[PDB]
Structure formats: C-alpha cells, structure tokens
Amino acid sequence: CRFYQHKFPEVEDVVMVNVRSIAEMGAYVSLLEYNNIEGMILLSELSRRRIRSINKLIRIGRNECVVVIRVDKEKGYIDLSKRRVSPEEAIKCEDKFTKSKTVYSILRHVAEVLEYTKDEQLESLFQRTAWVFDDKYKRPGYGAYDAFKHAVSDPSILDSLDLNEDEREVLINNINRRLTPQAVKIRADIEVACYGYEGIDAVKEALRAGLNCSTETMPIKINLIAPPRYVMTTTTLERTEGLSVLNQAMAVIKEKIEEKRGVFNV
Amino acid sequence: KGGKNRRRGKNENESEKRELVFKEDGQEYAQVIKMLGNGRLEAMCFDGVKRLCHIRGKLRKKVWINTSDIILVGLRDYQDNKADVILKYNADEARSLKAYGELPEHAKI
C-alpha cells in the first residue's frame, strides 16, 4: 500500500523508485516511495554526459533517487527525471524510504489480526493513524517514527489519540528492541601525577563521589586504562542529563588528590 | 596471426608429422636462454657449454622460435663462441626425446 503521507507526489519533490523494466525512450518504473503507481523516466534527462555502457547505469532491481518533474493529477501519469539529483538528497530520501518501511511494518502488526482480506485494509489504518502523528511534526522534519519513539520513552503520545489493543506490546517491544541498546559515550578525562603514598585510599573517596547527591549504593562503571588516567563512565541516561555528572566530577578527583601532597594536573 | 590476408600466396603447409634426426657430429640439442632482436638469438647447449646461436635461411620468417624450448644447433667447424641453428623440434617431440633418455634430463618446459 501507500508508504507516504500523500498518495500522489507533487512537483520538484525528491522520491525513490524501483526499476521493473527498461524502456527504449527511458525507463518505466514503479514507485516504492508512494503507491505502486507508474512513473516514466526519459532518456535525455538522466545525465549531462555521454553514456557508453547502459546496464552499468540504470538496471532492473535498483532503488534510484529521482525528482518528479510533472504529474497529471487526473490521469495518473507521474513524469520523472534523474537529471537533478544531489548525494545530499539521496541521504535524505534513503532515510525517509527506510523509516517508512519500518513504520509500515509496525502498522502491519495491526493488520495481522484485523479484517485484511481486501488490500485497502492497510490504507484504512494508514490514513487515520499516520496523518495525526506525522502532520503535527512534518514542518519540523520529523516522520511518524519520531511520534512512536516519543511514545515508548514517555507514554502519553499514543494515549492522546485512539489506542489500539495487542499493538501496544509489539509496539513497545519493537521500539525498545531496535532503537536501543542505549547508550552513553560518557567517559571521564582525569589526569593525576601524585607524590603521595596515601593516594590509594584518597582515590577511593574521590571515585565514589562521581555524582553528588546520589545514594551510596549507586552502580557506576569504573575503568582503569592507564596509571594516571581514571575513566568513570557516569550514570547512563542519554548523555544530555549526565553532562553535569561528567563535568563537575572531574573537578572532585583533581582537587581531592592535591590536598594530600604536591601539585597535580587540573 | 589473426587471419588477415596475403598469407596464402605461398605454400600452406604445415608439418604432416614427422621425424627425427639428432645430434649429429657437431650438430646437437640446445635450449633458448634469451631472445635478442635484429635476428640472432641466444641458446645454451645441453652439455654445459654456453654459445650464441644464429638463425638459418628459410627458417627465417617461416618458423617462429619463441623463448624457452629445445632446438637443434650445428656447431661451427672452427668457431666456439658463435654457433648455427638448424632444425628446431616440437615441444611434444622434445618431451618424447626426454622420455626416451637421449638428451639430458635437466630442463622443464
């Protein structure tokens, strides 16, 4: 069924297709960036340079990024072109192609149980759920994946509008399985060069105080990579909440060790 | 060659197969060492003595003697360093001679 918010493409929009035949006059191709509607590419507007081979360019069974040059709205002729394509558009379109595939796979679990004897089943599910998720956040550059990703980490998004059954478990499982494990790249940077002998116990007091105002029972990940370097991967959230945990903790270890003898790295 | 033409005005051919002198007195088997140009060429004899081999009439542009391979060489009656090519063989003919045990069993093809 449709993979996109609108059924028909517009004018000058970047899309994706999959080649199913090669024509004399260009390439007649099916879309997989929308419905399986037909769109015709023309030979002239594929490149601005010569062309020796022809199967080392376009061939069957390839996703190809393209621009919709014209569309007949009533007839359903989607004129197409590969002449204006930049690699930056390919990154943006590959993401939207891949994200729609995963979102429609989530909106396939819904159809496994419900009445789907007719092809239009998924279309019924798509219009009513998809649009209110993505339309509210299309202007900021988000897909319906953002709405679902927000629901798993704070559940009020999918309870603000009609909640389905049995969907919720598989929805949670698939969001939490695929978009994790989930991750902190927090590493402490600490340098010390002691003349102390009481440094061994001094470091222990400093290590356990990586995060202030936490319980004595807080689990953390200590790492020793080299003798002066003390890496502490602090409490694992998303690395946008443990910023204060990373920054101010570094001051503790370097200060605690200077009080017991000599100068150290700051 | 790769076909072409003007290669039929003149006597096709071929080696209807055939057979088999030797050695004779100062007329023995050698192996191609190098492959100079102009015309001449190098070829170490199978006994141990080196020598420099020379092409012979007819065999000029009527038979190509690629590098490496047995070939029949007359020795000059008086000259040591330069010697005179005769009568080449076939690679099959050379391995049959080797299997017979008449030339020394030292060189590979």
Binding site: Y195, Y197, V203, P227, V263 | -
Partner: protein, 422 residues
Amino acid sequence: QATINIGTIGHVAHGKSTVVKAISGVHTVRFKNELERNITIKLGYANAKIYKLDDPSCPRPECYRSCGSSTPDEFPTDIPGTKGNFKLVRHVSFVDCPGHDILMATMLNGAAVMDAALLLIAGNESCPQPQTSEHLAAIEIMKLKHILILQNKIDLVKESQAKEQYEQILAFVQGTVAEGAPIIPISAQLKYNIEVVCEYIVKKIPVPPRDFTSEPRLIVIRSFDVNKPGCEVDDLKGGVAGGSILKGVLKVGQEIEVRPGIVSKDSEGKLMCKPIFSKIVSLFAEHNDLQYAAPGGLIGVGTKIDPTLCRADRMVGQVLGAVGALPEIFTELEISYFLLRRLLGVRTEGDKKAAKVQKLSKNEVLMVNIGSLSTGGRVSAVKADLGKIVLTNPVCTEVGEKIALSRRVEKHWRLIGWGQIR
C-alpha cells in the same frame, strides 16, 4: 628468602637462559618478550632453593633422576640421588647483569650489590677477551674476591682453544685476584658438571658477616609493574622496589625514605632536594611470605609509593634508608681518583685500539657510578688527585666507599678509573 647474591655476568654469545635455568630454575626475563637478540641485556632477577640429599649435588623436586631437554641430539641425564625428602641448606639469590659492553654502566650498578660472582666465559671469541678483564677488575675494586670462573660455552670448542683461553685470561689478570678462584669447564648443551658447580658455590661462597643490628639501608635497582590489573582502580596500592639490603634487618610496616630526593619547585640553583617517604606494605622474596627482610638478600619491598615512579624503570640505583637516614645528599661532590694506564673493556685481535687515555679536561660530562647510583656530572675543577664534580641529579652517599669513573670514548662511556669519595 636469600643469604647471598651470586652474579651471572659474562660477555656476548655464551647463552644465558640455559645456565640460569640450571642454577636457579627461574628464567631471566624482562621487557620486550619477544626473547633476546642474543643474551640478556637487561638486569634479570631470580631466587632459588639449594638443598642436599647429603650429597654435593643439588636435587630437583623430582630427586630420583633428572633428564635434560637442552638438545634432542643426545639425552643428557644426571643422578642426584634417590628420594625420601632433602635437607634445605640455604636460600640463594642471583643477580643477572647485562652481558653487553654498551650496557657497562648498568652492569656496574647491578654488580655493586652482589656478594659473589660467576664469570661466564665463552670460547668462541678472543682468548684475553676485553669484558672478562673489565668485570674482574671492577669486582676486586668494589670489595669482592669470591669469584668462580665458569667456562660456559665450550660445547663445540676444541680442547686446545679452550685451554689457551683459560691460560691467557689467568695470565693477563696477573695483578687481579683469580688464583684462588676455581675454573669449572661445563657443558651448556648437555648440562654436564653442573653437580660439581653446586659443591663449589657452597665452598667458595659462604654467607659473609651481615650486620643486623645496624640501621636498614636498601638499594633499589629495579622498579615494579604495579599496578593496572584489577579489580578496583586507579593508580595502585602501590609500588614495588626490587632492591638488595646490604645492612640492617628491615621489618614489615617500617617507614622507609628514598634519599636522593626530588628537587624543589622553581630551583634557581642545584639545591634543594627533599627525600620521599613511603611505608612498607610487604616484604616478598622467593614465593614465600615473610615478616622480615634480613640483609644479604634481594627482596621485593612493596612500599606506599604510587604508580608513576614504577611505571617504567626509573628507580635504578636509588638509596633508601630507614627513616630519616643520616647519609648526605650531595649535589656537588669531592672525588679522589686514580686512572688506569690502559683503556679497560676494549681490546680486539689487532692493536686497535687500547692504550693510555689522555688526562681529563674540565667541563666534560663523565659518568660517576657511585654506589649503585649512576649519575652524569661535569668536572668543574681538575687536579690530579682532586677533582670537583657537579652532578645533574643528587647522589646519596651512604659511606665514602668507592666510585667508578668512565669517559665517553666514542658512542658510549667506557671505564677509565676508580677512586674513593672524600
């Protein structure tokens, strides 16, 4: 623990691992392993237990017989006795010094804390070989004469060649003690006559008088690889010094001071140095726990210093005294000295070169090996029997003892003379 320190010094290409494993049973090993471009060029460590079945031969644990594995060309077998437990005679310690000429300053340092030596000669090269003489002379200067020459590589060397070599060495060294030192030819490819070596080292080398009552002094020569394992970081509960003690019974929990010191921040001169103080965590020798560390033995003293001082070999030749030791920490020093009339440690097959070296000139850098310390320093005043040297890093002078003085002849320093501090 240990009772005596026997050193295993010997010039290039005689094989160290075969002989060292036969005597101690503990491999000589160090950084870069790897193995050894030839023979060990690091300062190796090893201890061992010497027992008897009431026989001059020393057993293995399996004391019925011993089948070597030095070569599969033939089977070398020896018989120490038969089994029913063996009586412990003593615990011995070794000091494997560098076997290569460039490493002379390190060989000197390591040597200077031994109580005896084993000159490992190799029959392959020249008969009055440079390094044999170099070693021997240094040994008689430091205060030792308990030497057992060992002909360590005469496996394929013919009996005329090997005979000529022992003769020429013993005839060149006509002014250095060596006539009361035995010369034991051995095999190092079939480990033969090893049993008779065991008889020699208990005979020629008893325990010399050790002063327990006198104040502890530990001379550290080797650092420690502590720490960085797990679990619980960082840096360590600290740092281990491989040192020998030459005076005093160092007890556990005692505080010890490393006396060359660390120099005060923003010094405009050559003074001031401040000793570092560390409490003794543990007194480990062999593989057996101890509460004491008797003198005359090489012991691993774990102390409460932190990883940076032991992360590399940086505690070579440091003097440690318990605690607030009286020994002065000079930065500029008054050497009395004398020179050799030959250049020691160099001499080849052809007169080229080895003769009389010219007199020292002021403002030249020379290695003064004082104690086990190795400092570099420049000569500020040069009179024949009174030179004044200024040292880069301060030297703790335990006693005025001896010194060894070397001069940079070419690529590296070479031994020129000795003397005594005033």
